[PDB]
Amino acid sequence: MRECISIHVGQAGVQIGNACWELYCLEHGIQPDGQMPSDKTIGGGDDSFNTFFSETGAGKHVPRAVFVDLEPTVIDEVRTGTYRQLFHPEQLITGKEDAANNYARGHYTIGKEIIDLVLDRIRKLADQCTGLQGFLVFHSFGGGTGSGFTSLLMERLSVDYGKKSKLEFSIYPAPQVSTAVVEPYNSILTTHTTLEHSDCAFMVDNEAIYDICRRNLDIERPTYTNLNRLISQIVSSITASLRFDGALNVDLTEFQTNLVPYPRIHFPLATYAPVISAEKAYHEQLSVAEITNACFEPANQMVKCDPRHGKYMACCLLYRGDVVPKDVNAAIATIKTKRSIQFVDWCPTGFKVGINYQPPTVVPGGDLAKVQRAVCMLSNTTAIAEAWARLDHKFDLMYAKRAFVHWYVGEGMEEGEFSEAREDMAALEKDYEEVGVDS
Amino acid sequence: MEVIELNKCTSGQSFEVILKPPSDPSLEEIQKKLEAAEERRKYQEAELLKHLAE
Amino acid sequence: MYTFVVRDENSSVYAEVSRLLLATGQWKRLRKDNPRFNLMLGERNRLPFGRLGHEPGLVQLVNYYRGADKLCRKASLVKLIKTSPELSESCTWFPESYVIYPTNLTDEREVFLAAYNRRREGREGNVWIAKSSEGILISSEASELLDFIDEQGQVHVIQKYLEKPLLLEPGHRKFDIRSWVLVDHLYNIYLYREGVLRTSSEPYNSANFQDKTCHLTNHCIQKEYSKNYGRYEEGNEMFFEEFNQYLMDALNTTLENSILLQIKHIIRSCLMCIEPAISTKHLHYQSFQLFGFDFMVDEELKVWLIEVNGAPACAQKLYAELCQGIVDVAISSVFPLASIFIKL
Amino acid sequence: MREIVHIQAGQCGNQIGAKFWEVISDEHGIDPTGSYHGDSDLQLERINVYYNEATGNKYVPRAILVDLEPGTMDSVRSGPFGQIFRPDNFVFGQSGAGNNWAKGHYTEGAELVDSVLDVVRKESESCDCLQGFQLTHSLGGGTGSGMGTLLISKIREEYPDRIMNTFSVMPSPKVSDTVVEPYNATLSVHQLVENTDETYCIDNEALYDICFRTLKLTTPTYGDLNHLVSATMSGVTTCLRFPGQLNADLRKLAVNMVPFPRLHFFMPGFAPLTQYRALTVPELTQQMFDSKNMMAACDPRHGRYLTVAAIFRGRMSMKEVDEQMLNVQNKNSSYFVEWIPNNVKTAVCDIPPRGLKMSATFIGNSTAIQELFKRISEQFTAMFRRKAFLHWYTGEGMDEMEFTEAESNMNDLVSEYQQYQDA
Numbered sequence A: 001m002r003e004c005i006s007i008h009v010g011q012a013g014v015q016i017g018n019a020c021w022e023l024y025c026l027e028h029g030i031q032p033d034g035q036m037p038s039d040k041t042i043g044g045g046d047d048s049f050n051t052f053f054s055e056t057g058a059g060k061h062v063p064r065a066v067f068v069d070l071e072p073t074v075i076d077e078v079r080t081g082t083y084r085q086l087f088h089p090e091q092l093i094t095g096k097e098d099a100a101n102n103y104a105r106g107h108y109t110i111g112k113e114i115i116d117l118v119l120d121r122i123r124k125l126a127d128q129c130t131g132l133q134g135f136l137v138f139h140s141f142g143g144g145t146g147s148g149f150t151s152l153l154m155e156r157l158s159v160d161y162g163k164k165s166k167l168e169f170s171i172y173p174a175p176q177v178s179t180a181v182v183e184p185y186n187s188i189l190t191t192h193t194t195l196e197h198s199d200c201a202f203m204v205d206n207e208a209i210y211d212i213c214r215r216n217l218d219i220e221r222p223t224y225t226n227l228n229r230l231i232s233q234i235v236s237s238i239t240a241s242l243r244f245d246g247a248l249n250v251d252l253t254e255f256q257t258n259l260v261p262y263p264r265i266h267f268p269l270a271t272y273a274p275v276i277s278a279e280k281a282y283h284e285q286l287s288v289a290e291i292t293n294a295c296f297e298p299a300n301q302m303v304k305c306d307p308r309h310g311k312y313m314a315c316c317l318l319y320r321g322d323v324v325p326k327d328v329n330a331a332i333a334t335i336k337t338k339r340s341i342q343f344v345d346w347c348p349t350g351f352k353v354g355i356n357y358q359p360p361t362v363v364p365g366g367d368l369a370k371v372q373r374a375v376c377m378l379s380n381t382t383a384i385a386e387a388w389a390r391l392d393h394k395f396d397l398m399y400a401k402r403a404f405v406h407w408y409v410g411e412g413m414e415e416g417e418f419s420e421a422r423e424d425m426a427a428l429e430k431d432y433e434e435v436g437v438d439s
Numbered sequence B: 001m002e003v004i005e006l007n008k009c010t011s012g013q014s015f016e017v018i019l020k021p022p023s024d025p026s027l028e029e030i031q032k033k034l035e036a037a038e039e040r041r042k043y044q045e046a047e048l049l050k051h052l053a054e
Numbered sequence C: 001m002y003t004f005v006v007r008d009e010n011s012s013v014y015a016e017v018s019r020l021l022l023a024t025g026q027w028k029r030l031r032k033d034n035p036r037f038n039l040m041l042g043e044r045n046r047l048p049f050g051r052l053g054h055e056p057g058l059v060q061l062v063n064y065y066r067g068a069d070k071l072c073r074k075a076s077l078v079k080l081i082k083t084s085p086e087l088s089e090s091c092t093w094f095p096e097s098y099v100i101y102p103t104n105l106t107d108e109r110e111v112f113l114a115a116y117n118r119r120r121e122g123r124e125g126n127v128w129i130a131k132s133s134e135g136i137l138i139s140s141e142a143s144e145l146l147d148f149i150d151e152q153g154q155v156h157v158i159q160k161y162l163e164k165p166l167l168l169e170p171g172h173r174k175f176d177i178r179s180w181v182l183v184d185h186l187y188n189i190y191l192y193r194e195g196v197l198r199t200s201s202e203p204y205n206s207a208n209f210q211d212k213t214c215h216l217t218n219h220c221i222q223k224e225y226s227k228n229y230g231r232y233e234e235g236n237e238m239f240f241e242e243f244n245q246y247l248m249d250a251l252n253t254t255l256e257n258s259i260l261l262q263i264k265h266i267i268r269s270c271l272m273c274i275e276p277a278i279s280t281k282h283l284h285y286q287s288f289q290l291f292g293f294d295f296m297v298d299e300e301l302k303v304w305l306i307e308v309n310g311a312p313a314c315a316q317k318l319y320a321e322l323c324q325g326i327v328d329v330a331i332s333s334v335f336p337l338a339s340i341f342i343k344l
Numbered sequence D: 001m002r003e004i005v006h007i008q009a010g011q012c013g014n015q016i017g018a019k020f021w022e023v024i025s026d027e028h029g030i031d032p033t034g035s036y037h038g039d040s041d042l043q044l045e046r047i048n049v050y051y052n053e054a055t056g057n058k059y060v061p062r063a064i065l066v067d068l069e070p071g072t073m074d075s076v077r078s079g080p081f082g083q084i085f086r087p088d089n090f091v092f093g094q095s096g097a098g099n100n101w102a103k104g105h106y107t108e109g110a111e112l113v114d115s116v117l118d119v120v121r122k123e124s125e126s127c128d129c130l131q132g133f134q135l136t137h138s139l140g141g142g143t144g145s146g147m148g149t150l151l152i153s154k155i156r157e158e159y160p161d162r163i164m165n166t167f168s169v170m171p172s173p174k175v176s177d178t179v180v181e182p183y184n185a186t187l188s189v190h191q192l193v194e195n196t197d198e199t200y201c202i203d204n205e206a207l208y209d210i211c212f213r214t215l216k217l218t219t220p221t222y223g224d225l226n227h228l229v230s231a232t233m234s235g236v237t238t239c240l241r242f243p244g245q246l247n248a249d250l251r252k253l254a255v256n257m258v259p260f261p262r263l264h265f266f267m268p269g270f271a272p273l274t275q276y277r278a279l280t281v282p283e284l285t286q287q288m289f290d291s292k293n294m295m296a297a298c299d300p301r302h303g304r305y306l307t308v309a310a311i312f313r314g315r316m317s318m319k320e321v322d323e324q325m326l327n328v329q330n331k332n333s334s335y336f337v338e339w340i341p342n343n344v345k346t347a348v349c350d351i352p353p354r355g356l357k358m359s360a361t362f363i364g365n366s367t368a369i370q371e372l373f374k375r376i377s378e379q380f381t382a383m384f385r386r387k388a389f390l391h392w393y394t395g396e397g398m399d400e401m402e403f404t405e406a407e408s409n410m411n412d413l414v415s416e417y418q419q420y421q422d423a
């Protein structure tokens, strides 16, 4: 058994992390006070769920997690929330003044003053691991903390844990649910600085989650609470392989081996089905073929883009619930003959499949209906480059006039860092184009 | 349509289907960047204080 | 009020559509780079499809289908027809064709020669035409065809030349049929009821493939090199009413029975084949597009597809009706205000 | 804890400031004695932003009242909520400033400024985490204009990393006390260009027109003008004072509204402008973007919006709010710059202001504000070309060169706006 440490940075990271750990506790039968009656090895064990939870002599199962934010209001809700007893104070780190949506403030001005405290709290968790695999890092692109402090932390983690893997869950900015305007700057700046330190990053576009919540959950105006419950279901689908017995994606290294042949192109597209409204009286349960086919509908993707006009490098299918291999193969064969699924020439046209028999857990009194089977597809397609193109174009519009740049220079950042970061993104867009397009 | 590497446990199973075969900065360098930005903040503040002193 | 942007100034069709949109008092034209548009009349090349459908609260529509180039490039069309089971290499309405990359650059050289030799030994007519996306060479010798492509730099297609075309009388002259087809956001396929024959004004001469004026029917070639330009019909353009009346008087048949049934069949086959790859049914933005299909007719009244043009112009006397039709079926169907097509 | 320190200077500044505290005291359920008597814990959640807690659940405004003559602050201390302010926070002299920027900034004000900073320091030292400062004043007088901008400069020297926002009443010949108002305002504007992060430009002419043309008041008083400012200030500070979708401090709010450091002068607006028929969301949205609801007497159709924020208050449909904002932007598509994507943002707060079921407050960063500075510059030059009324200023030690420089500075500001209006 090898442990994983989760790090939640900024408002988006903290609130998503709070939703995930609630869901983890429900999936593993862990009560809010930390007790887990089904764990017969009191104060110990190296079961699969122990990769995410340590144990005290009193039988409390403690998340291997650190929450970091530069102002206290969001983390204070963890301290006083339903699962307050789960965490101890050392895991919850708060500053006094936030980064004001300013990457330079989160990375240079405030980051410099808190980075050593955050590493010491992480070191404490690492000293409790017999074989640390690495880290899972949750954050927004658009926040000053989520962007600026995350990239500083990732740099130092590469230094202090050179051999350890680092995965990201990154919230990509959507104007529909944001009151900021400088987020394209923060996104390009943090991606540039983090690219070489992240082994595999799962981007979630708030626009996609927002529209899934309106379209499939019949929520007229989704809130962050609605969005985070859905995101936490997808995150759980992705991390379940680390927390349960199995043979696919059993350690962090396997994510890169299975999903990222090209180190810079390490942004897999996530697709999830089915998303069903709990308010619905009764829903006819979808079959393996139907939920699998739904994995190739843009309407169910975590990032809106058209995989028909890109190429695949890898595809993983992660099923939960009443699913057997025979029905997966039957569904795949059918979809190959009806869908546009082009792989790159230097990769096998195939699917790695993982099935966990436990159906998705839902938060009681939530928006998601209980289903008998669900699936999350992780595919590394060049089509996700559309999301970089959108972001880079917004960056270019503002930077040509140097709009808002003075806020960053005022915190000690140099203008050259903007153009350096934008040129890295331009090279990234070219890498995607070389991999996925024919002349 | 070949199924390979089929593994089965009580919690589930996993396998692979093949439809067709194919054809860092150091601690010192980070500190320098952080201290260089802090020094630019100091210089810009010193210029402001000079302006206000005039 | 609805909003739209214009990004292809060289489009005669959508310059007129733009005109009609304003004259409704309910459409406003924005600057070409304004992202808060309802309708984009996009550029021909490198249209930024990846930036469409991400403006909150706006329904966005574009006048091109992403991926339709597969049908509207000469080498792409050959590959699509050969590799698509719906169409297959036994496709009866598409002339035998082969993709040939210049040697200074997969390729089907040896497959073309294999069929070329089979025709020569069998006494069968062995005239082929090389073309790409001037730039045309009609020859009965494979050596002159492969040497012409090597001097170029882009991919070319060698295609069996229709040696026995239907010839209009008087004149003994060749022609081709242009059909305009509109595909809306629901992937309804609308065939404009009015087509045009681009006629040659020089008598067809099967003994001289060197003078490419009675063999090439392009309007530009006739206007510059043909000394009989405009002799029989204005601008070498014959329309369906006259052509139908000719088929009745000369061949005792109708345009619908002898030709249009095959045209409708071919249009439907091509567009249904590519539908899963380009449909915007469940996309965050929606597409429509106007297509120009070019057809040849042989002396047995068999119709052959020659090419599909993804950015076609229209006949001068047909701009008014067709462009209004685009507004009615393609635009106002998505943005309603306050038939000239045949639905296939 | 995101404390804000409030300062009000001079006659206009103290009269508008007093109304501001009456309005928000009512919203937070604080009575004239500083005791809470609300019905909702929402009223106390962010009470600390503007109030200090004393013994016995007493809430004292974090407010500093400044003037160079005692008259207006005697009126405040006798006003409705006059007893709510900390007596130690009244700082005043006796000589007055004679509507003279030089007296406020260089002579009379210089003698009093140190005692004001002493109070400011005491209020700041007891802040857990100071957000920044807000100042209410006019630009056409002597104390608010001259001593107010002197205060801002000394606060920036002592607290250079803190946000400084001002609600600044711009003079108009149609609602004027003295002919030297353009001199005082031109001298002050340059100080604000350098030393504030946001300046809400409140034109007394716009306030007058609204009272006369829209509210149907044949003879508006300064009180009627100040009711509009009070209501606008309540809406502008709503997201700081009540829980909602926004959790931004002053710095984050300014980051997303100010793309260039000198172009931080905002056109504020409010709807409904003072009836028992509650407004529909479409009506709120149309009126708040209407020039007639603006308070800077600048036509937005004459320039371009760099950024816009609008906050809606009351129980209403978020979906319909979103729908209506989309409708307003297409009608004004030509009046938003295209190189700041998504530059129109909205927020909702469930708690409506007193006497209204719903309302909306508008904050526009528009290049049309250059019309306001052009007006002032013209009136300045009409007198300065003849050196008229200058002896009032040279008599306090100023020389003509400082007027020449202030004139050049504001013509540069106007030019900078015109540059981005054509970008």
Ligand SMILES: Nc1nc2c(ncn2[C@@H]2O[C@H](COP(=O)(O)OP(=O)(O)OP(=O)(O)O)[C@@H](O)[C@H]2O)c(=O)[nH]1
Binding pocket: A009, A010, A011, A012, A013, A015, A016, A069, A070, A098, A099, A100, A101, A102, A106, A140, A141, A142, A143, A144, A145, A146, A147, A171, A172, A173, A174, A177, A178, A183, A206, A224, A225, A227, A228, A231
């Ligand atoms: N999905 C989701 N997105 C969020 C959530 N909270 C904030 N965001 C998004 O994150 C971006 C704003 O960044 P934040 O995470 O709030 O900022 P931060 O990391 O706390 O950094 P600061 O600027 O210091 O506050 C916007 O795009 C928001 O839409 C959340 O709970 N869920």
Ligand SMILES: Nc1ncnc2c1ncn2[C@@H]1O[C@H](COP(=O)(O)OP(=O)(O)CP(=O)(O)O)[C@@H](O)[C@H]1O
Binding pocket: C095, C129, C131, C159, C160, C161, C162, C163, C175, C176, C215, C216, C217, C218, C292, C294, C296, C306, C307, C309
């Ligand atoms: N296989 C074939 N057999 C007989 N004639 C042919 C032929 N291919 C082309 N032609 C003749 O050559 C002419 C031009 O061919 P092609 O269609 O490639 O040119 P083009 O791409 O310019 C048409 P457009 O201008 O509509 O795009 C046609 O009008 C047709 O008469």
Ligand SMILES: Nc1nc2c(ncn2[C@@H]2O[C@H](COP(=O)(O)OP(=O)(O)O)[C@@H](O)[C@H]2O)c(=O)[nH]1
Binding pocket: D009, D010, D011, D012, D013, D015, D016, D097, D098, D099, D100, D138, D139, D140, D141, D142, D143, D144, D145, D169, D170, D171, D172, D175, D176, D177, D181, D204, D207, D222, D223, D225, D226
């Ligand atoms: N809106 C408003 N404007 C005022 C008020 N009192 C004065 N003014 C304006 O403020 C300017 C005069 O400045 P004032 O505040 O009286 O002088 P000060 O005491 O030296 O700061 C003139 O432009 C007046 O029109 C007021 O109560 N409300």
Ligand SMILES: COC(=O)Nc1nc2cc(C(=O)c3cccs3)ccc2[nH]1
Binding pocket: A179, D134, D165, D198, D236, D237, D239, D240, D246, D250, D253, D254, D257, D309, D310, D311, D345, D346, D347, D363
């Ligand atoms: C004391 O100074 C302020 O209150 N400044 C201020 N309040 C603001 C409120 C907003 C605001 O309500 C919204 C921001 C985004 C959507 S509404 C914006 C900028 C602001 N600046």
Ligand SMILES: [Mg+2]
Binding pocket: A010, A011, A071, A098, A143, A145
């Ligand atoms: Mg934050």
Ligand SMILES: [Mg+2]
Binding pocket: C307, C308, C309
């Ligand atoms: Mg062509």
Ligand SMILES: [Mg+2]
Binding pocket: D011, D012, D141, D177
């Ligand atoms: Mg006065």
